[model samples]
Target: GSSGSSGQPSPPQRPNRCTVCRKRVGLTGFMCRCGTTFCGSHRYPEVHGCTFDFKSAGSGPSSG
Candidate 1:
């Protein structure tokens, strides 16, 4: 039962390039936890100085 779905138009394209250096990775792009693609040179979070927190922060068994 679809209504008059005036959906927002999506971006035309997301070039397969490294987010860090904009290097053309083609199908060799690496996906990082920051939700961006990067090349092998900067695939590591530490290498790109990613701001995404990969730690759980609070998964203690004492939590309610």
Candidate 2:
């Protein structure tokens, strides 16, 4: 009697990755306040120009 091949190898199958380069990033993934994953290269939210409003998220705006 012999056992079947049930061994598996770990690979990149995660959703967390850089939006700019489209690279898979798990441990080194940077979560931006703009609500998106980014690599070390695009760690700064300004670089991506995220749509998430930082000021509005914190406080409400009275003026239009």
Candidate 3:
């Protein structure tokens, strides 16, 4: 039966690299509307807000 059949899982998507810096990008990394990836260092300041700066943003939200 279809319910009991064993099936292989789909392959994971390939990591998207930044165009400018050529660095692997995660989901939270800067991405353009046209599906372009950008590393934290090469991301545009005005578009994606400021980069993860410890001195400016202060280490982000504190986790418990």
Candidate 4:
């Protein structure tokens, strides 16, 4: 190792926060299909209203 510093400051690290609750996500966090990561409490897509467009059958008519 060098005895002196590089003299240049390095960039800061980015933190992983819940896309829904805005809390610090843990190792057990969830990554949604919408490409967003969130905490365990808001893991479910519906819980966060994820924008992943989960095209599921609804009460409405068909896509005619």
Candidate 5:
């Protein structure tokens, strides 16, 4: 079975600290796609001014 299930509910991986505020990131902190960690207050890329490119108009793959 190619199912990604380990039969255990594994939580998302957490980073050491927040790259934006230089503060301790909580267990539920954000893992951004711009290659950086952020706290709950700075989760949104637009709000934190992430370094990732947002020039694409498309979101993801289309339904086939």
Candidate 6:
């Protein structure tokens, strides 16, 4: 089935460091939609600006 081959390879692991604060954040961290990785302490609401185009930018299953 198509679902069986839907498993994609995981992204490469990065070091435990915040891109903004430059502080150690261990392993558990969050990555932004723009592909920028941030630590727990640096994961704030205003850390990154919201510029995502949900309408024009394909976000559904049929989208590329």
Best by TM-score: 4
Candidate 5 RMSD to the real structure: 9.1
Model 3 TM-score relative to the real fold? 0.40
lDDT of each candidate versus the true structure: 0.81, 0.77, 0.65, 0.80, 0.77, 0.64
Candidate 6's displacement at residue 64, Å, is 3.2
What CA root-mean-square deviation does each model show from the true structure?
A: 7.5, 7.4, 9.1, 9.5, 9.1, 11.1
* Count: clashes, candidate 5: 0
Tens-digit per-residue lDDT, 9-63, candidate 6? 8775756666777676666777767556677766764765634445575554773
- Collision pairs in model 4: none
Which prediction has more favorable lDDT, 1 or 5? 1
lDDT of 1 by residue, 1-64 (tens): 8887677868658668788888877677898887878898889999988988656477666644
For residue 8, give model 3's deviation from the true position in Å.
15
Candidate 3 residue lDDT tens string, 1-64: 4585478876767777876767677865787644467777667745544444444446568765
Report the number of backbone clashes for model 4. Answer: 0
Candidate 2 lDDT over residue span 4-62, tens digit each: 76768767567676887768766788988877898888888778877786465555566
| Candidate 4, superposed: residue stretches over 4 Å from native | 1-14, 53-64
Span of ten consecutive residues with least summed lDDT in model 6: 50-59
Which residue segments of model 3 deviate by more than 4 Å?
1-12, 45-64
Total backbone collisions for each predicted model: 0, 0, 0, 0, 0, 0
Greater-TM-score candidate between 1 and 3:
1
User: How many residue-pair clashes does candidate 3 contain?
Assistant: 0
